[PDB]
């Protein structure tokens, strides 16, 4: 025959075999400026009927579709009505009284008591000091350095709010200089501070404000049942069943219940930052003005945001056989003869918005950033489905995330179901929410999908998580075993990893571990460089079951004991002398549980590591700093000098140090104090 | 000698001196987070490449004296220190043997897990569509008689007695747990930091939201990969001093002290000691008897 | 902070602070710092006047603990912990009794040692600044000032401390410990809060120039400034705006449900054009092997020596000929490169010091094949702007190709059982739990039906070849290295074999990035005549190199042996993708186990002996002219493994998109089969999204044909 | 194995559609399979070449005319593979063509062996 794996769905329901419709297990081995231009053009086209203004601070053209013409077709529209958004927010507050006030009270603490180092946690971030993407910590250090070079010294208190005050103060001065000695005027600095690099990253000036906004949004979402974003694992599978139970508990069953397996692909491009500003303004009513101000800055800078085009285009010449790179910065004056038909149309339609090498993108939002706030906006529409709001025989409820949504509509008859679906769709349009009527479908309640969670008559399958790596981690062979078994155990608990699949992942990990560390079992014929030592250890050992895998021992790991460190697991089966050798504190070589053994060995801005040198020097004077956060009102120099003086004094009297060395230490301490007064 | 020389070197520079002289000890957790990145160039491939070559591991200079240069078979074990993993296997095979008696006490929680699993009982496995409920379940069961802060103080007075703060040093009465932990770990050589981390695991309670369809006794939560899955439930039963701060350092009362010599100075004598991870303070022994009681009654007299 | 203060202070002080704040008219939820500061002030005042009494005669005592003896004055008067009016009345009464001077400002305590009022102060900043501020504010009166700090500092008026050193030390220690606790909790941000003399200000985050102006341009139209917008939002009620806007909204804006019936779906439209051609990194079903039964000696070894042995085992090399030219490259260069490979392998039999890795001489044919012939130079646009034929790199649409039948042949052979094992998995601990026994049963049944699989051979082939390529690229960055294509297996008699498929010649691999391309030439043995499906070999130059001699019952029959040669390229990401092909076994086992578990949730029992061990049960996994064909459980396992391996082996964005969209179409079809009355909103749009990724990829086109067969048979 | 799979595939072709000479082609394919089995039996009998002398006296004509229908069958299979557009038929016919090309050479070497 001809094998057709798709025919398996003729016997097995789609949901039970849906796992076979996911091609990859991990990031595929494949991956531009043209896409960025397409995104900008689409974003401005969906909202082209709004007002046009030129920024007085940047000179960038800006498009404002808020309160624009109402749509008259089923195309994406950014014309979100301010009054409609505010009414939805008011009704959300009404259905959950005290939600916004309580969220603001909870968030003020985070705003007041957050440290600047909170801003080092994240993926690559755009670095305005270098016009390049950098790690969060490096970008933060660079920003702090450049701010210090200028008269901006307020983040030297360990508060994110003080660093954000520095950010606000930076935009006031008329000159910003970067030493590596570049000079930036006010307009160029503003343009680089509002730049979103490239699936997009903001600079190290919008990240703190975004963080506070997202904290407030998480606080709000934690109190909403329809919010499916913040939770994840087997408690989202609870939400999927809970909504169906809510919508299916009918008395004298006559109503019809239909479920929309919704899709909202590319719905961020119709999310205007101005509506998010209105959202935050309504959420923070009757709150301190400082809190309103700090929460009302990220949308302010997103309304003025600007997309960096990226690398650019590359050209080819078949005659002279040469290549050139054309940076997007100079792609505003190039003659359009070189470009392709599609590309020259893009470059022509985006030229008006190009300024200082970046496109001006006021309308819309990019993936990420305001995920929680968009979830709040969606739950606002889901909140309007209550009969008290839909004053009709039909009502709806559902789940909301930043990527997908689910809707359940209940009505006495099919016409009522159509009326409910139409009303939900039209209310979504009034708030700039564009349902994708290309990837959405409706069926009677009993089966639906939500963020790769497939529900079928009470059974939910979680296929939203990529099967993780089950190879070595690249650390000592003692830590790799612990990490490998812990990853499997954690996937069994959180990502619905099957027992048999977990056992075979254990087998593959043990194979990879043995081939990386050449620790094949002592009774095998495999001949590595390490085979002789391992075989000698195998022969000399009476109990060939307490030997670790690192020592050519057996693998005793199974499902029941994935939570137990290997050394403890094999402790009772160990030879006493092998214990004494392996677990010898005086050996030459040295979120997981591992016992320190001989296998815990170690293998092979003018000063980037300046910050990671004073801390390491402090840890030598105060070893407890590696376990607990240091506390003290004195300086680093005073602490270390006093420690050295006391230690040298006690050490000289103990005889471990001669008098001359003690005098030398005291002299160096005096010199260090002298340097302390410069 | 080396540490102070490195400190002098750092403060010779214009930038590092600024950090050292301006950053207080409080704001180090912040500074420690200013690091670089982009180092994981597929570290598994790096480890394979490193294990492919000889002498991948780093050992102390004593390696040359404890372990012979060449194997019984003629295989080189170390070189100028850069060491082969065959040296690790050699040490595990015929290296020095010591008494591993502290390990059951330091790693008591891991051995508790081992004992619980060893004597546990398995019932049948039931296939249903059970519902798991999100609950605050404690992953690590801390000591019942110790609060979160009291547990940290015990870990601090037993592992780093020389860096205890004014809260520990100025509070009369010592917990019995600290007294027994000090004698249990009197001669322990494992490591101060590993000991501190295991003590934290043993003494401090940790809690998380897990969706669980059964017990939450901290013994049913460790075995959760084993007891519950997508569509099945596995029946399982687990086996079983006082001082007073007077002000900043005073040079009239001699040099500074560490927190071990305060044990014998005098009753009511003034001395200055380096407490915690920083500032030196002038302290005495509390001459009078001060205790905490129902001070509300005393204050109501006004 | 609010939680902290209710834990560091006794109930009476917290109650007094709350009463004082209520009297002043502030909420502790918004001014937690002021609450903490006032609580700290009260406690210090109480500690000041504690255990101190005036002796019956002209003397003072410090008797502590309960003192029922009486006859002793308290030595102090509490004025801070009282109402404004009551405090003023008490102050006036005591001043009149002692005839002192009434202070202009409210005092804190009164001392009987001297007829003076003591104002206590706790500062979260430098002590001398606070003392100077108090002196400037409090002047021209006989008033005493005592200042405490959180750092242990202290000063009073004229260095006249009016308490025993022990009590002052107690206050200092209390403040010091409070400071440490706040710093540990991260609440010591109140250090600045009390920096303005009065600790009542709240945080101030202002919006000013260049941000007040940006703010006024980032708000809905018809509003001039952000303050007017805030005023509008603050006064706002749900007057019913959504209903009015919906009334004004055009009826063309609708989500109409179009029924999805048995006859609405149509077959997906696949492209027209020239048939697709093979694009994998190695031959799959046309691959030939030269094998040696290496006598144990496990542990890899030297792949070059194994290749040399496998080559020596073969006799039959003839004069190379081109039987199917590449038509896009110089064909004589390909047989020149093959001859060079042969000669170089013959040279290793000299040079007494046998090499572990071989490097090929950089000749003209080998430089041309490996793209060494200079690539276009990195000139600057400022100079080459007048080259006329200067266009974009791609500037070309993707060509449309029709599905050919060889990609179904490949998948048919991938799902078959071979004679070797191709995988040996490590052991795990013995099972004690019933669920562990079920897991072992499923895992063993799966592994037994998948070890001797052709798709499992492809996994090992890809892993080995990509590992060798990555090692050569990293270690031999600047030379042409010969890399044998080798895999290992076990026969039914449990005997190790080393197999040689061909040779890869790597180019110059200076890979800074993970997407940098390293060129290589692959040379793979085969018994397949390229002239039967010449369209499948569009990118290959095929040579006839020898005459393999195959044993048969009638006799030993000779067949021609070919060499499929093609230039190819790869990067670090692609090599790593190849090295991780063992995850396909995990994916297929996970899929089978998900099937078992879904059927187990229903029926509330373990459906593991019903999938396996039940020979009667068969699944539809194929198609013939008779119709749908049924297969056994193990054959389903092998088919799923082959599907996963081909997904990894032909990975492309087209495959990802097609899977994403055909999943939705499949779910709609299932809903139709479940009698759940499915409906759509734009089915044509979904079909367009599905068919926009059907261009030229053999795997994606075969998957589309599979879906078309499923659509034909499911709605029937 | 190849004969078994190819004949199984051709049987599906025979019943899914009408028997457009496929029935005769299949009959021929089993005839050739049994013929090759007889050749293998004689090759095993090679232990006694004396009887193989008379068997070869028969094999002269038998081989000649069997080779005749084998070549003409290969031509027919090529013709069918050239005109068919159905993937199942294309795969079946390519497998059959390869098998016939192999078997032709097998019988050719046997013919040279017995001369």
Curated annotation (Swiss-Prot), chain A:
Q: What does the entry list under GO cellular component?
A: host cell cytoplasm; host cell nucleus
Give the reactions, separated by semicolons, that this protein catalyses.
RNA(n) + a ribonucleoside 5'-triphosphate = RNA(n+1) + diphosphate
The answer, when asked if Manganese is one of the entry's keywords, is: no
Q: Name one GO molecular function term.
A: nucleotide binding
Q: Where is this region: Promoter-binding site?
A: 207-214
Please give the residue ranges the record annotates as the region Disordered: 50-79
Q: How is it modified after translation?
A: Phosphorylated by host PRKCA.
Kindly give the Pfam families that the UniProt entry links to this protein.
Flu_PB1 (PF00602)
Compositional bias of type Polar residues: which residue ranges? 52-61
| Stored InterPro entries | RNA-dir_pol_NSvirus, RNA_pol_PB1_influenza
- The RdRp catalytic domain covers which part of the protein? 244-441
> What does the similarity note say?
Belongs to the influenza viruses polymerase PB1 family.
Record's function text: RNA-dependent RNA polymerase which is responsible for replication and transcription of virus RNA segments. The transcription of viral mRNAs occurs by a unique mechanism called cap-snatching. 5' methylated caps of cellular mRNAs are cleaved after 10-13 nucleotides by PA. In turn, these short capped RNAs are used as primers by PB1 for transcription of viral mRNAs. During virus replication, PB1 initiates RNA synthesis and copy vRNA into complementary RNA (cRNA) which in turn serves as a template for the production of more vRNAs.
This protein's assembly is summarised as: Influenza RNA polymerase is composed of three subunits: PB1, PB2 and PA. Interacts (via N-terminus) with PA (via C-terminus). Interacts (via C-terminus) with PB2 (via N-terminus); this interaction is essential for transcription initiation. Interacts (via C-terminus) with human PKP2 (via N-terminus); the interaction competitively inhibits the interaction between the RNA polymerase subunits PB1 and PB2.
UniProtKB/Swiss-Prot annotation, chain B:
One protein family per Pfam: Flu_PB2_2nd
Motif Nuclear localization signal: where?
Answer: 285-288
SUPFAM superfamilies cross-referenced by the UniProt entry: PB2 C-terminal domain-like
Q: Where in the cell is it found?
A: Virion; Host nucleus; Host mitochondrion
Top-level division of the source organism's lineage: Viruses
| Function according to Swiss-Prot or TrEMBL | Plays an essential role in transcription initiation and cap-stealing mechanism, in which cellular capped pre-mRNAs are used to generate primers for viral transcription. Recognizes and binds the 7-methylguanosine-containing cap of the target pre-RNA which is subsequently cleaved after 10-13 nucleotides by the viral protein PA. Plays a role in the initiation of the viral genome replication and modulates the activity of the ribonucleoprotein (RNP) complex.
Its UniProt miscellaneous note says: South Carolina isolate has been sequenced from formalid fixed-lung tissues of a 21-year-old male which died in 1918 at Ft. Jackson, SC. Brevig Mission isolate has been sequenced from lung tissues of an Inuit woman buried in the permafrost in a gravesite near Brevig Mission, Alaska. This sample was recovered by John Hultin, retired pathologist.
Q: Assembly and interactions? A: Influenza RNA polymerase is composed of three subunits: PB1, PB2 and PA. Interacts (via N-terminus) with PB1 (via C-terminus). Interacts with nucleoprotein NP (via N-terminus). Interacts (via N-terminus) with host MAVS (via N-terminus); this interaction inhibits host innate immune response.
Task: Tell me which family the UniProt entry assigns to this protein.
Answer: Belongs to the influenza viruses PB2 family.
From Swiss-Prot, chain C:
An example of a GO molecular function for this protein is: endonuclease activity
**One of the Pfam families matching this protein, by short name:** Flu_PA
Q: Which UniProt keywords apply?
A: Cap snatching, Endonuclease, Eukaryotic host gene expression shutoff by virus, Eukaryotic host transcription shutoff by virus, Host cytoplasm, Host gene expression shutoff by virus, Host nucleus, Host-virus interaction, Hydrolase, Inhibition of host RNA polymerase II by virus, Manganese, Metal-binding, Nuclease, Phosphoprotein
User: What PTMs does it carry?
Assistant: Phosphorylated on serines and threonines by host kinases, including human casein kinase II.
In chain numbering, where does the motif Nuclear localization signal 2 (NLS2) fall?
184-247
- Give the EC number(s) listed in the UniProt record: 3.1.-.-
Source organism superkingdom: Viruses
Just give the chief location class: host cell
Q: How does it assemble?
A: Influenza RNA polymerase is composed of three subunits: PB1, PB2 and PA. Interacts (via C-terminus) with PB1 (via N-terminus).
Q: Other remarks?
A: South Carolina isolate has been sequenced from formalid fixed-lung tissues of a 21-year-old male which died in 1918 at Ft. Jackson, SC. Brevig Mission isolate has been sequenced from lung tissues of an Inuit woman buried in the permafrost in a gravesite near Brevig Mission, Alaska. This sample was recovered by John Hultin, retired pathologist.
Give the record's family classification: Belongs to the influenza viruses PA family.
Task: State the protein's name.
Answer: Polymerase acidic protein
Q: Which organism is it from?
A: Influenza A virus (strain A/Brevig Mission/1/1918 H1N1)
UniProtKB/Swiss-Prot annotation, chain D:
Q: Provide GO CC annotations from the record.
A: host cell nucleus; virion component
Function text:
Mediates the nuclear export of encapsidated genomic RNAs (ribonucleoproteins, RNPs). Acts as an adapter between viral RNPs complexes and the nuclear export machinery of the cell. Possesses no intrinsic RNA-binding activity, but includes a C-terminal M1-binding domain. This domain is believed to allow recognition of RNPs bound to the protein M1.
Q: Which organism is it from?
A: Influenza A virus (strain A/Brevig Mission/1/1918 H1N1)
Q: List residues traversing the bilayer.
A: none
- Write out the similarity annotation: Belongs to the influenza viruses NEP family.
Name its cellular compartments. Virion; Host nucleus
For this UniProt record, the keywords arranged alphabetically read as follows: Host nucleus, Host-virus interaction, Transport, Virion
Has UniProt tagged this entry with the keyword Transport?
Answer: yes
Coiled-coil annotation reads none
Query: Which superkingdom, per the lineage?
Result: Viruses
Q: Where is this motif: Nuclear export signal?
A: 6-15, 79-88
What do we know about how this protein assembles, alone or with others? Interacts with protein M1. May interact with host nucleoporin RAB/HRB and exportin XPO1/CRM1.
What InterPro entries does the record tag this protein with?
Flu_NS2
Annotated protein name in UniProt: Nuclear export protein
| Additional remarks | Average number present in a viral particle is estimated to be 130-200 molecules. South Carolina isolate has been sequenced from formalid fixed-lung tissues of a 21-year-old male which died in 1918 at Ft. Jackson, SC. Brevig Mission isolate has been sequenced from lung tissues of an Inuit woman buried in the permafrost in a gravesite near Brevig Mission, Alaska. This sample was recovered by John Hultin, retired pathologist.
Q: Does the keyword Iron apply?
A: no
Offer one Pfam family short name for this entry: Flu_NS2
The alphabetized list of GO BP terms reads: exit of virus from host cell nucleus through nuclear pore
């Amino acid at each position: 025959m001809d094998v057709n794996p798709t025919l398996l769905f003729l016997k097995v329901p789609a949901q039970n075999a849906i796992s076979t419709t996911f091609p990859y297990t991990g990031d595929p081995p494949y991956s531009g400026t043209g896409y960025t231009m397409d995104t900008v053009n689409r974003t401005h086209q969906y909202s082209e009927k709004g007002r046009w203004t030129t920024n007085t601070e940047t000179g960038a053209p800006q498009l404002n579709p808020i309160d624009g013409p109402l749509p008259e077709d089923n195309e994406p529209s950014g014309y979100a009505q301010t009054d409609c958004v505010l009414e939805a927010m008011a009704f959300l507050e009404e259905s959950h009284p005290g939600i916004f006030e309580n969220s603001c009270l909870e968030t003020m603490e985070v705003v007041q008591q957050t440290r600047v180092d909170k801003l080092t946690q994240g993926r690559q971030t755009y670095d305005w000091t270098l016009n390049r993407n950098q790690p969060a910590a490096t970008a933060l250090a660079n920003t702090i350095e450049v701010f210090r070079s200028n008269g901006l010294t307020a983040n030297e208190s360990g508060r994110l709010i003080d660093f954000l005050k520095d950010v606000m103060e930076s935009m006031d001065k008329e000159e910003m200089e970067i030493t590596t000695k570049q000079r930036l005027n006010k307009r160029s600095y503003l343009i680089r501070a509002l730049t979103l690099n490239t699936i997009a990253t903001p600079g190290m000036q919008i990240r703190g404000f975004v963080y506070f906004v997202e904290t407030l949004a998480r606080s709000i979402c934690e109190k909403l049942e329809q919010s499916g974003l913040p939770v994840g694992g087997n408690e989202k599978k609870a939400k999927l069943a809970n909504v169906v139970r809510k919508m299916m508990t009918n008395s004298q069953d006559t109503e019809l219940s239909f479920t929309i397996t919704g899709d909202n692909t590319k719905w961020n491009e119709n999310q205007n930052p101005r509506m998010f500003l209105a959202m935050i303004t309504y959420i923070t009513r009757n709150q301190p003005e400082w809190f309103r101000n700090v929460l009302s800055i990220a949308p302010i800078m997103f309304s003025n945001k600007m997309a960096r085009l990226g690398k650019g285009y590359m050209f080819e010449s078949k005659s002279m056989k040469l290549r050139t790179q054309i940076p997007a910065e100079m792609l505003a004056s190039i003659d359009l003869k070189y470009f392709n038909d599609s590309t020259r149309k893009k470059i022509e339609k985006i030229r008006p918005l190009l300024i200082d090498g970046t496109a001006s993108l006021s309308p819309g939002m990019m993936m990420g950033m305001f995920n929680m706030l968009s979830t709040v906006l969606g739950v606002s529409i889901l909140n309007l489905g209550q009969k008290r709001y839909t004053k009709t025989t039909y009502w709806w409820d559902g789940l909301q995330s930043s990527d997908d949504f689910a809707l359940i509509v209940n009505a006495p008859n099919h016409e009522g179901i159509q009326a409910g679906v139409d009303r939900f769709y039209r209310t979504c349009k009034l708030l700039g929410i564009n349902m994708s009527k290309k990837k959405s479908y409706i069926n009677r309640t009993g089966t639906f999908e939500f963020t790769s969670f497939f529900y079928r008559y009470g059974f939910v399958a979680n296929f939203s998580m990529e099967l993780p790596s089950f190879g070595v981690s690249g650390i000592n062979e003692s830590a790799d075993m612990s990490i490998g078994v812990t990853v499997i155990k954690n996937n069994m608990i959180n990502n619905d990893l099957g027992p048999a699949t977990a056992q075979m992942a254990l087998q593959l990990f043990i194979k990879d571990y043995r081939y990386t560390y050449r620790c094949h079992r002592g009774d095998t014929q495999i001949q590595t460089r390490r085979s002789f030592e391992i075989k000698k250890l195998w022969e000399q050992t009476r109990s060939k079951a307490g030997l670790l895998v690192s020592d050519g021992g057996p693998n005793l790991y199974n499902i029941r004991n994935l939570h137990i460190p290997e050394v403890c697991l094999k402790w009772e089966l160990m030879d006493e002398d092998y214990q004494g050798r392996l677990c010898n504190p005086l050996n030459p070589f040295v979120e997981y549980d591992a016992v320190a053994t001989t296998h815990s060995w170690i293998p092979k801005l003018e000063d980037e590591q300046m910050y990671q040198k004073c801390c390491n020097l402090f840890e030598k004077f105060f070893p407890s700093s590696s376990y607990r956060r240091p506390v003290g009102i004195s300086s680093m120099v005073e602490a270390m000098v006093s420690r050295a003086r006391i230690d040298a004094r006690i050490d000289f009297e103990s005889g471990r140090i001669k008098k001359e060395e003690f005098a030398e230490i005291m002299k160096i301490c005096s010199t260090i104090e002298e340097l302390r007064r410069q | 000698m080396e540490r102070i020389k490195e400190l002098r070197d750092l403060m010779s520079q214009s930038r590092t001196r600024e950090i050292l002289t301006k950053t207080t000890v409080d704001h180090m957790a912040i500074i420690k987070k200013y690091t670089s990145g982009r180092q994981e160039k597929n570290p598994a491939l790096r480890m394979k490449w490193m294990m492919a070559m000889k002498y991948p591991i780093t050992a102390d200079k004593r390696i040359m004296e404890m372990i012979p240069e060449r194997n019984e078979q003629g295989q080189t074990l170390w070189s100028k220190v850069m060491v082969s993993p065959l040296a690790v296997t050699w040490w595990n095979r015929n290296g020095p043997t010591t008494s591993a008696v502290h390990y059951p006490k330091i790693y008591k929680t891991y051995f508790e897990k081992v004992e619980r699993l060893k004597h546990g009982t398995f019932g049948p496995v039931h296939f249903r569509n059970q519902v798991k409920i999100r609950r605050r379940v404690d992953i690590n069961p801390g000591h019942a008689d110790l609060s979160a802060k009291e547990a940290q103080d015990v870990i601090m007075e037993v592992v780093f007695p020389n860096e205890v703060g004014a809260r520990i040093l100025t509070s009369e009465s010592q917990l019995t747990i600290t007294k027994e932990k000090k004698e249990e770990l009197q001669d322990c050589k494992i490591s101060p930091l590993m000991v501190a981390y295991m003590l934290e695991r043993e003494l401090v309670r940790k809690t998380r939201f897990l969706p669980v369809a059964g017990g939450t006794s901290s013994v049913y939560i460790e075995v959760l990969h084993l007891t519950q899955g997508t569509c099945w439930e596995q029946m399982y039963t687990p086996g079983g001093r006082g001082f007073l701060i007077l002000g900043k350092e005073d040079r009239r009362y001699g040099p500074a002290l560490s927190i071990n010599e305060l044990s014998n100075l005098a009753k009511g004598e003034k001395a200055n000691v380096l407490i915690g991870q920083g500032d030196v303070v002038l302290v005495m022994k509390r001459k009078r008897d001060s205790s905490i009681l129902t001070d509300s009654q005393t204050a109501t007299k006004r | 902070m609010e939680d902290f203060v209710r834990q560091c202070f006794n109930p009476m002080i917290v109650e007094l602070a709350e009463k004082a704040m209520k009297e002043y008219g502030e909420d502790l939820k918004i001014e937690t710092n002021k609450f903490a500061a006032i609580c700290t002030h009260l406690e210090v005042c109480f500690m000041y006047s504690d255990f101190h009494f005036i002796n019956e005669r002209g003397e003072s005592i410090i008797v502590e603990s309960g003192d029922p003896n009486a006859l002793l004055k308290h030595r102090f008067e509490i004025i801070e912990g009282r109402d404004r009016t009551m405090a003023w009345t008490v102050v006036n009464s005591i001043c009149n009794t002692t005839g002192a001077e009434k202070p202009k400002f409210l005092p804190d305590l009164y001392d009987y040692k001297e007829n003076r009022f003591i104002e206590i102060g706790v500062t979260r900043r430098e002590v001398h600044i606070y003392y100077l501020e108090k002196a400037n504010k409090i002047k021209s009166e006989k008033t005493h000032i005592h200042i405490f700090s959180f750092t242990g500092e202290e000063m009073a008026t004229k260095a006249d401390y009016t308490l025993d050193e022990e009590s002052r030390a107690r206050i200092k220690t209390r403040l010091f410990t409070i400071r440490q606790e706040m710093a540990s909790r991260g609440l010591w941000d109140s250090f600045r809060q009390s920096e303005r003399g009065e600790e009542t200000i709240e945080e101030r985050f202002e919006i000013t120039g260049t941000m007040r102006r940006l703010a006024d341009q980032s708000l809905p139209p018809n509003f001039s400034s952000l303050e007017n917008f805030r005023a509008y939002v603050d006064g706002f009620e749900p007057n019913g705006y959504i209903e009015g806007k919906l009334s004004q909204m055009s009826k063309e804006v609708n989500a109409r449900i179009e029924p999805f019936l048995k006859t609405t779906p149509r077959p997906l439209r696949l492209p027209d054009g020239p048939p697709c051609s093979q694009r994998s990194k190695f031959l799959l079903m046309d691959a030939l092997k030269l094998s040696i039964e290496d006598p144990s000696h496990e542990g890899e070894g030297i792949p070059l020596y194994d290749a040399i042995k496998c080559m020596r085992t073969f006799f039959g090399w003839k004069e190379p000929n081109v039987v199917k030219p590449h038509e896009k490259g110089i064909n004589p260069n390909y047989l020149l490169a093959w001859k060079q490979v042969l000669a170089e392998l013959q040279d290793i039999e000299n040079e007494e010091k046998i090499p572990k890795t071989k490097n090929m001489k950089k000749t003209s044919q080998l430089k041309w094949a490996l793209g060494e012939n200079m690539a276009p130079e990195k000139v600057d646009f400022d100079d080459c702007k007048d080259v006329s034929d200067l266009k974009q790199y791609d500037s070309d649409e993707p060509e449309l190709r029709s599905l050919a039948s060889w990609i179904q042949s490949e998948f048919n052979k991938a799902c078959e059982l071979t004679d070797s094992s191709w995988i040996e998995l490590d052991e795990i601990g013995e099972d004690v739990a019933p669920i562990e026994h079920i897991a072992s049963m499923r895992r063993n049944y799966f592994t037994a039906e998948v070890s001797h699989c052709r798709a499992t051979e492809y996994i090992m082939k890809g892993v080995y070849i990509n590992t060798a390529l990555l090692n050569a690229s990293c270690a031999a960055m600047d030379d042409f290295q010969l890399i044998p294509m080798i895999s290992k297996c076990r026969t039914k008699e449990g005997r190790r074999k080393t197999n040689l498929y061909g040779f890869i010649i790597k180019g110059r691999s200076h890979l800074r990035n993970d997407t940098d391309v390293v060129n290589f030439v692959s040379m793979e043995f085969s018994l397949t005549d390229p002239r039967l499906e010449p369209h499948k070999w569009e990118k290959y130059c095929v040579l006839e190199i020898g005459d393999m001699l195959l044993r048969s019952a009638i006799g030993q029959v000779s067949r021609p042996m070919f060499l499929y040669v093609r230039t190819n390229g790869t990067s670090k990401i692609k090599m790593k993708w190849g090295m991780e092909m063992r995850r396909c076994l995990l994916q297929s086992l996970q899929q089978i186990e998900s099937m078992i578990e879904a059927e187990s949730s229903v029926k509330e029992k373990d459906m593991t002996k019903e999938f396996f061990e039940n020979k009667s049960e068969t699944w539809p996994i194929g198609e013939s002219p008779k119709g749908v064909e049924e297969g056994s459980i193990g054959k389903v396992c092998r088919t799923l493994l082959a599907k996963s391996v081909f997904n990894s082996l032909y990975a492309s964005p087209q495959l990802e998109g097609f899977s994403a969209e055909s999943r939705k179409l499949l779910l709609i079809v299932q809903a139709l089969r479940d009698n759940l009355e499915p409906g759509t909103f734009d089915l044509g749009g979904l079909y367009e999204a599905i068919e926009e990724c059907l261009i030229n990829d053999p795997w994606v086109l075969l998957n589309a044909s599979w879906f078309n067969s499923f659509l034909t048979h499911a709605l029937r | 194995s190849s004969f078994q799979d190819i004949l199984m595939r051709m049987s599906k072709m025979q019943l899914g559609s009408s028997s457009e000479d496929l029935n005769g082609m299949i009959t021929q394919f089993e005839s050739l399979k049994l013929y090759r089995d007889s050749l293998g039996e004689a090759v095993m009998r090679m232990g006694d070449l004396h009887s193989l002398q008379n068997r070869n006296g028969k094999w002269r004509e038998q081989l000649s005319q069997k080779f005749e229908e084998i070549r003409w069958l290969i031509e027919e299979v090529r013709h069918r593979l050239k005109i068919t557009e159905n993937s199942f038929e294309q795969i079946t016919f390519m497998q059959a063509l390869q098998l016939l090309l192999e078997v032709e050479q097998e019988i050719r070497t046997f013919s040279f062996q017995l001369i």
